[PDB]
Amino acid sequence: DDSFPIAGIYDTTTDNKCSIKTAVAKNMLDPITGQKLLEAQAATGGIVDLLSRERYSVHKAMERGLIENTSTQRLLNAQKAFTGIEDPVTKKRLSVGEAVQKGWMPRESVLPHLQVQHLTGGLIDPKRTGRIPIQQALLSGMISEELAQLLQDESSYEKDLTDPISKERLSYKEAMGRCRKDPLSGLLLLPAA
């Protein structure tokens, strides 16, 4: 819905929603999984505020207490997948898929973010609404053949998240599947105790 990422956590013990930040702090969600969920938010348009559905840049999120100080640095990297970057030579704005091809960023750093973009409707073209399908991205040279193939093969995505309920290792796609929608906000919440 609305091409949003996983937004927050569903506290199964109290039947209440809570933020990723609160869940990590209360030991309801493992810290690494929490950080990756926040990266996915940065990479798709901003950190989600559960109370309003608004989304915020990393800096604005920290100032509003939506994230911890210790997350800010790594979240800025993920945020580039949304904003794109400026080419140091040509000064043009590049998507991160183009940055990889131009040698400015390593493929390994960028793939997870393109994966989350794909799973929420398609690749992001910086400064534009409307997601780009993988095949269109490939034909335009926005991504390489290898990145396209990796993005297409959803069943093979890395299982680097831990389901707080089952303790199973899940991919981002599987994690999305475990989510409920919040009755108030409509946003995706991952259950945790």
Residue numbers in the entry: 1822 to 2014
What does the study report here?
The structure reveals a basic groove that can accommodate acidic patches on the cylindrical surface of monomeric or multimeric intermediate filament proteins.
The asymmetric unit was comprised of two PRD molecules designated ‘a' and ‘b'. Models comprising residues Asp1822 to Ala2014 were built and refined to R and Rfree factors of 16.8% and 20.5%, respectively. The two envoplakin PRD molecules in the asymmetric unit are similar, superimposing with a root mean square (r.m.s.) deviation of 1.1 Å for 183 aligned Cα atoms. The envoplakin PRD structure has two lobes and contains 4.5 copies of the canonical 38 amino-acid plakin repeat (PR) motif followed by a C-terminal hairpin turn. A novel conformation is found in envoplakin's PR4 motif, where a long loop is found instead of the canonical β-hairpin. A striking feature observed in envoplakin is the non-canonical helical structure and distinctive kink of H2 in PR2.
